[model samples]
Target: GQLQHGIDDENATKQTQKYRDAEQSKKTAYDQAVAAAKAILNKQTDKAAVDRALQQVTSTKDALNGDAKLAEAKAAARQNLGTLNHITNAQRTALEGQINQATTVDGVNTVKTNANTLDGAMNSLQGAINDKDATLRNQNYLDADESKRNAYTQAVTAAEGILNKQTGGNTSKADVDNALNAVTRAKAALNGAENLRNAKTSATNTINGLPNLTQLQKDNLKHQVEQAQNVVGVNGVKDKGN
Candidate 1:
């Protein structure tokens, strides 16, 4: 009967005044703990608080049954870091430690910031390489001597350094075309100079074959011969016409 009476008192705490005050305190603690859990689940406040909140809720809830919010948060955080796919080997190595250590949203943000820095550096380097390719290609086609067109070759080499170092897919096709076109145009210009010399040789031979000429006509022909001799001697020769 005594045990039954004790059980009655314990169960009756649901309505009896004797346990009301104690019950209220218990209820308040439960409410506060649940609220804290929800706040973390909702990802409230900044990165630090959200991460801390996630840890608390996940730890409280037991890691085995880890809540949907906890799973979702981890997936989203990893996705953010994964988007940095266009990085170099050195950049990836440098970022790996920070990524592994990140426990909170705030930590992941730091990793993200470092990733952005690496991306910016890569973009700037690629831009500089592109500009060099353009400048060298232009110089080769426009004015560089045949012997000096090696600058175009060097430009292609330097751009390849960046291409090979990048984790990004495929090198730029425009760069390849620029290097090839420069060589082609430069060679064509050099060949045109040779054609001009051949034309000068045939013109000088034609003028010398004319025989029915007055002294004035002969003098004019001589002047033309001198022009051809000045312009295109054999193998760049400077000898007077016979």
Candidate 2:
């Protein structure tokens, strides 16, 4: 019986909080709704009639479910940070892996599949080369390259080549070296992006279905804030009327 009493008290507190929040929230929502209706209708005196304005205000007040709106808003806010963190962390890992091993045949390949390949072996010597290529590609995908320095060297060279083509100029040996140093930085960035993407997908899946859930959440929050501010404007109008 004592335990039951405690539980009841807890329930009562929760209910009271919810009800109070709802009342405050409804007032806020109501005032804003009235302002909006008034603006479009020209005045409370203009709408269907003064009786209609009062009726509309009453219906709008009744429709205000502050607790429910707040519950959803609060939930979105709570999840926002966690979701962002998850996405950031996941992408960070991926980008870090790439940056760390950017120069390696196995490293970049690991991020993607081994789509880039030579078709066939020409001869014994060439076969050895082909096999090595296959080995490196396989290693890249698996990220099992033992020589970090070699991977770094190749990554630098590859980056410079790309840069040279992009710039349409002579890529100096020094520039190539500089590009190599950028590997670690690039990897970190890519990993971060990958992490964020994953986080977004996960967080979105948890929420009640909204079209483009995260985007919708942002829109809802924006609209709610706007409504709140509008209600704050109502007193100015009421004072003018007075």
Candidate 3:
């Protein structure tokens, strides 16, 4: 028994060290992301540096997948990067292309100062392009769908509302992403005749109708309710729970 206890202690020590190392690496990646974001904000032209930092952030997050605490840490890092005004490579390229096309100094200056920050300016420019594309694509989908699914229509409408509210891409891309995901899920639920809707209803009803639940259970249910509201759609029906 003592030998077994010693072995367990050794294993625990090793695991703790691994966790520490993971935390350090995660911090390093996060720092790089911050530094790179600041650099881009200062120069607004350092694509290589920003891309390298983003790559590091991604890899570090991937490496932290298995450990629960580390996973949370990694998720925090991802949010930090997003908060840093991370943009896609395509967006960066498109912005650069547009900037290059500007012939006059005033025009260039106008583009640069269009948003509150350099990152916001680039985001706003790219968002405008994306907004146009999404609108056209959604319209095409509406035109093509003979069934005229109400849920899909509602989802697209909701997504368009969020997209419309974006001023100079002032909305965080992370928020935009979450909204887009909600729309997609809602549309998917509608596609097969409300299977997802029925499922969500059953899940929510089961929890709320339960006769006895711990406070922890109730809290967990609350979390579930919030997730359902944010991540899923229930037909064209809006409810307090949804």
Candidate 4:
């Protein structure tokens, strides 16, 4: 009977309701111990029977089935740390270590706090890479020239390459800064080489379609068109009038 009411006395704890809800098996064990205690009439001269039952009741009641808070806390800490980035690998390792070593619920909470603190201060290089808008894309150059399209695509790739390395490693901002400069410079210098190509195509077609021109003469005109590497040179000797 004493053991029956013992759990009520032990109920005033943080994990009491949590324990009672999820740990019915442990509660059954405690009830069995209580039944054993109740069945004993003060029969033993040494009171060992009473003592054993009392010990079992207290032990089972106090066990709390190891509680779910600690496991939940550890899992939550690990989950938060997994995606929480923007910190150095060294800082990541330290936070992972903190999460791994946390034995108690509050210790895991401390690990999360440390992880969140680092994640809050996002790396400036990462921000710059993310801030690169649609203006750097190759499609933006279709309005201009193939030369600009190729240059912009190449610069975009170089920027992404440096950013992939810089954002993920223990590197400096200079590399990313240089890549960003390339993007800016490439964006501003988007004048094209495609017009030159179009002029060459038309120049060759005109020469090929000519009624009096021989094949060698067409070759000569195509060779001349090929040398007009820039738009100005192409337009200079573009047509028969030129």
Query: Among these predicted structures, which one has the highest TM-score?
Result: 4
Q: What is candidate 3's CA lDDT for residue 46?
A: 51
Better of 1 and 4 by TM-score: 4
In order of appearance, the predictions have TM-scores of 0.33, 0.18, 0.20, 0.35
Sort the predicted structures by lDDT, highest score first.
4, 1, 3, 2
| Model 2, CA-based lDDT | 0.38
Cα lDDT tens digits for candidate 3, 1-242: 22223223433433442334445666455445445444554565356655655565445545542244533443443343345353444433444444455443344444444322535533443443344345434523433334545544564554455444232233444565555565555444433333344545666665576667755665566455535432233222224333
Q: Give stretches of model 1 more than 4 Å off.
A: 1-74, 140-242
lDDT of each: 0.47, 0.38, 0.45, 0.62
lDDT of 1 by residue, 30-123 (tens): 3344466555445543666655554543343232221233334445645765676555565565565566665544455666675665555556
Q: In angstroms, how far off is 65's CA in candidate 1?
A: 13
Deviating ranges (above 4 Å) for candidate 2: 1-49, 61-71, 80-181, 184-242
Against the correct fold, how does model 2 do in TM-score?
Answer: 0.18
- Ranking 3 against 4 by TM-score, winner: 4
Q: How many residue pairs clash in each candidate?
A: 0, 16, 0, 0
Report the CA-based lDDT of candidate 4 relative to the real structure: 0.62
Model 2 over residues 92-114: C-alpha lDDT tens digits? 34433443444332333433321
